[PDB]
Design a protein around this ligand. Structure first.
Ligand SMILES: *[C@@H]1O[C@H](CO)[C@@H](O)[C@H](O)[C@H]1NC(C)=O
Ligand SMILES: *[C@@H]1O[C@H](CO)[C@@H](O)[C@H](O)[C@H]1NC(C)=O
Lengths: 50, 56
């Protein structure tokens, strides 16, 4: 069933107790944090040999 | 607890696993801030079961 990704994230937040307003009012910050984490994962896997 | 849906003309609120449309009232939604930062905001009139009852 198709669903917009912001609404999916709102459902995920509701799954841990956080309401939807926290995501809908801080969507840009959460998106930037997710992008930064995904970017750091690559260099973390590249640099660390173990 | 649900999701806003629309059949083209009117807006309804239903649960996330079964299409059960109902009028968007005050007891179905909660207020949190103003609509100036939410991306995807649409204008819609919410129902209040206190104004028609206070007609008497
Ligand atoms: C949407 O639903 C409402 C109420 O059930 C109805 O009055 C309206 O005609 C419907 N719109 C369409 C396009 O079917
Ligand atoms: C209708 O929505 C627009 C944003 O799409 C908003 O600027 C406008 O104020 C709304 N209308 C009313 C009467 O609030």
């Amino acid at each position: 069933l198709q669903i917009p990704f912001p609404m999916q994230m709102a459902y995920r937040f509701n799954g841990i107790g956080v309401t939807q307003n926290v995501l809908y009012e801080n969507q840009k910050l959460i998106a930037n944090q997710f992008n930064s984490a995904i970017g750091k994962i690559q260099d973390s896997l590249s640099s660390t040999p173990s | 607890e649900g999701v806003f849906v629309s059949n083209g003309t009117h807006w309804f609120v239903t649960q996330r696993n079964f299409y059960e449309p109902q009028i968007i009232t005050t007891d179905n939604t909660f207020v949190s801030g103003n609509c100036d930062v939410v991306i995807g905001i649409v204008n819609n009139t919410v129902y209040d079961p206190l104004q028609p009852e206070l007609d008497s």
